[PDB]
């Protein structure tokens, strides 16, 4: 399957780290002064369409 490019910090099923997708149940953190992506644990949200 293929989702889409993230657009808000806290997503999961999106292209977080590079072109690879994270995994529901985690928590990605976008834009953060140099930190464009980081698949960290926590509770993210299924990037809607």
Curated annotation (Swiss-Prot):
Q: Output the GO biological process annotations, alphabetical, semicolon-separated.
A: negative regulation of serine-type peptidase activity
Location comes to: Secreted
Query: Which Gene Ontology CC terms are recorded?
Result: extracellular space
Q: Which cysteines are joined by disulfide bonds?
A: 6-14, 16-28, 22-39
- The answer to whether the entry has keyword Metal-binding is no
- The positions flagged as glycosylation sites are 45
Q: What is its main location?
A: secreted
Q: Where is this region: Interaction with thrombin active site?
A: 1-3
Q: Which GO terms describe its molecular function?
A: serine-type endopeptidase inhibitor activity; toxin activity
Keywords linked to the UniProt accession: Blood coagulation cascade inhibiting toxin, Disulfide bond, Glycoprotein, Hemostasis impairing toxin, Pharmaceutical, Protease inhibitor, Secreted, Serine protease inhibitor, Sulfation, Toxin
Function, as annotated, reads:
Hirudin is a potent thrombin-specific protease inhibitor. It forms a stable non-covalent complex with alpha-thrombin, thereby abolishing its ability to cleave fibrinogen.
Similarity-based family: Belongs to the protease inhibitor I14 (hirudin) family.
In Swiss-Prot or TrEMBL terms, this protein is called: Hirudin variant-1
Specify the species: Hirudo medicinalis
């Amino acid at each position: 399957v293929v989702y889409t490019d993230c657009t808000e910090s806290g997503q999961n099923l999106c292209l977080c780290e590079g072109s690879n997708v994270c995994g529901q149940g985690n928590k990605c953190i976008l834009g953060s002064d140099g930190e464009k992506n980081q698949c960290v644990t926590g509770e993210g949200t299924p990037k809607p369409q």
